[PDB]
From Swiss-Prot:
<protein>
    <recommendedName>
        <fullName>Putative gene 49 protein</fullName>
    </recommendedName>
</protein>
Length: 117
């Protein structure tokens, strides 16, 4: 049901990295949720969903996931993809890797992706 997408130490800075991936997993608008943290950014699809405490145990714990791990240094499944950087065509899609994996924190399970721009 829920599936997250993230970025670590993004070269682009947040700058609304929420709108970069913008639910590249299954969100149209407002359906997406994103937590901004230094060196670790979380974009989740928790529209009508919370773990229990309004972003607790993943949606700011996956932050920890990315924070103890690193891109490539993860047990994941990488795909070559491209994402639009929030803004207009001038802010053209960048070539990035989609590192597919699962973040299992105790209460929830969701297909999370490393969206390293």
């Amino acid at each position: 049901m829920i599936k997250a997408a993230v970025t670590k130490e993004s070269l682009y800075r947040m700058n609304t990295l929420m709108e970069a991936f913008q639910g590249f997993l299954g969100l149209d608008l407002g359906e997406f949720t994103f937590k901004v943290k230094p060196g670790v950014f979380l974009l989740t699809d928790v529209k009508s969903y919370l773990i229990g405490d309004k972003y607790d145990d993943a949606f700011n714990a996956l932050i920890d996931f990315v924070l103890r791990n690193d891109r490539d240094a993860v047990e994941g499944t990488e795909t070559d993809v491209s994402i639009r950087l929030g803004l207009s065509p001038s802010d053209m899609v960048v070539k990035r890797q989609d590192k597919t994996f699962t973040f299992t924190h105790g209460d929830l399970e969701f297909e999370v992706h490393w969206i390293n721009l």
